[PDB]
Design a protein around this ligand. Structure first.
Ligand code: K
Ligand code: K
Ligand code: K
Ligand code: K
Lengths: 409, 204
């Protein structure tokens, strides 16, 4: 995946946008742009609104101004995005006709949604037992285990949707950059993986602090709080609400506290093993290829749709892989998640990726492992033998908030 | 502030008020603010605020709440960065500790009046019978933002009835690399699009 980051950062045309004007600057020293046209496209949350093309005619080191036509105003709420691409119409000795040599995106106008969701005809029903809070609505059921404080099962009709409960996750199967030169017989205590292991991040157990249920006018509200601890040290506190309303949507609000003296964690998110295996993964967010917070320039915001296997990057030494960032909607099987998150989705658990030394030894697990992160640490790489994630990509804020809506698709 | 939603729910040990507002200008929605206020049997009011800011509006100077309190009290006591005025791009000198000053020391008398007296990184503020806890920036004084904006000279300011409190989840840098062109660096501009903050308001 890193190759596309290199291609993008090494582009030979640079772009600025001011109003309707794209300024194209050539970083060629010798050639005119005699095999180039610029394709531009504007889309509303991935729905195409307009597009066109203009030939590039820019001297080496020169500039060209391209004035976009006035766009019709979008017919609904959302964010308009401009993407431009430089396409070479003619084959060369080194490329085929249609080769894309450069791209860039910008946010254009945003019209925030102010329209209220229509009041639903049904209201969900809570059953309280010693073991569980259960919520039923039509063809859906959600079960919160009261001893664990997690969503342990959901049903659509008779079908269970979870193989493992939805739980917080603060670790990642460590990248080569997280490990550096550390080895079992010669620990490098400075490496990220060793800081996390020494602080108990991989071993920490959830302690339940609070698990309560209330009914609102139009919804059932489940409130939980957990502490992760290691040898008497509280590493992380996760406070949540789940609100399940008459429309079938479950809104999940998560507020995490991270002890200031614990090493900053690899991620702040949730995970679960879904019962289903589906063929496609469809999302509105950065893509199409794997992208991480400090390696996401090349990815573009649009609507992507790939086979599940494309969502796993087969690094020979297995690790956390396949994240996509800046995602506002994710679709898989009957499920839809909305928010502003990073995710990966695959048949391999973090545990399996961490434990397995070679990609050919991985086996697909039952169902589909989903990791959905409010926040994810950078991956680094300035070298691979000392910590290299720059401070602005470390999760050092202390308090973190994210919110997800889980509904049917 | 167009009102989108205002509801009340009576819970087990609390009343929950939920609001949503859109700020608009000439048809353009600039900001949305969604809040809950949870008032419990201990008398605490927990306020949660989630704001959306249109990506195409200029980044805002602050994202916060304000009000004019009836109370005028002698001291201001906070656990936060101080003791002097500090802003996000000018707070290295301020230290985190418990500070306790006369009210007048929470106003900086710039000859040309403007926003002034913020203290950042504050976890607890006390003023008269009130206490606010969270992780916020604040200023507190006898002068409204409107009055500071409209008044050309500090000697023309008049103390208003009561006390103006501005409590911000987030505040833009002040800049200063020069004073004739925008100078607040990107990392101190409120560009994130979505902002969350939470406060508890109680008595004592
Ligand atoms: K990008
Ligand atoms: K491994
Ligand atoms: K400081
Ligand atoms: K003034």
């Amino acid at each position: 995946p890193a190759l596309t980051e290199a291609k993008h950062q090494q582009q030979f045309f640079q772009f600025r946008l001011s109003g309707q004007t794209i300024e194209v600057t050539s970083e060629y020293l010798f050639r005119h742009s005699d095999n180039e046209l610029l394709h531009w496209m504007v889309a509303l949350d991935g729905k195409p609104l307009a597009s066109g093309e203009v030939p590039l005619d820019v001297a080496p080191q020169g500039k060209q101004l391209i004035e976009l036509p006035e766009l019709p105003q979008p017919e609904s709420a959302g964010q308009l995005w401009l993407t431009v691409r430089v396409v070479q119409p003619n084959a060369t000795a080194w490329s085929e006709a249609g080769h894309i040599s450069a791209w860039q995106q910008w946010r254009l106008a945003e019209n925030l949604s102010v329209t209220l969701p229509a009041a639903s005809h049904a209201i969900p029903h809570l059953t309280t037992s010693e073991m569980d809070f259960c919520i039923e609505l039509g063809n859906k059921r959600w079960q919160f285990n009261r001893q664990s404080g997690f969503l342990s099962q959901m049903w659509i009709g008779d079908k269970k949707q979870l193989l493992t409960p939805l739980r917080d996750q603060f670790t990642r199967a460590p990248l080569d950059n997280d490990i550096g030169v550390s080895e079992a017989t010669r620990i490098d205590p400075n490496a990220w993986v060793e800081r996390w292991k020494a602080a108990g991040h991989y071993q920490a157990e959830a302690a339940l602090l609070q698990c309560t249920a209330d009914t609102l006018a139009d919804a059932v509200l489940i409130t939980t709080a957990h502490a992760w601890q290691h040898q008497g040290k509280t590493l992380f506190i996760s406070r949540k609400t789940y609100r399940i309303d008459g429309s079938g949507q479950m809104a999940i609000t998560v507020d995490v506290e991270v002890a200031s003296d614990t090493p900053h964690p690899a991620r702040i998110g949730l995970n679960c093993q879904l019962a289903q295996v589906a063929e496609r993964v469809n999302w509105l967010g950065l893509g199409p290829q794997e992208n991480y917070p400090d390696r996401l320039t090349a990815a573009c915001f649009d609507r992507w749709d790939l086979p599940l296997s494309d969502m796993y990057t087969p690094y020979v030494f297995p690790s956390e892989n396949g994240l996509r960032c800046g995602t506002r909607e994710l679709n898989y099987g009957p499920h839809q998640w909305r928010g502003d998150f990073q995710f990966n989705i695959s048949r391999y658990s973090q545990q399996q990726l961490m434990e397995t030394s070679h990609r050919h030894l991985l086996h697909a697990e039952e169902g589909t492992w989903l990791n959905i992160d409010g926040f994810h640490m950078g991956i680094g790489g300035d070298d691979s033998w000392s910590p290299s994630v720059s401070a602005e990509f470390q999760l050092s804020a202390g308090r973190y908030h994210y919110q997800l809506v889980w509904c049917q698709k």
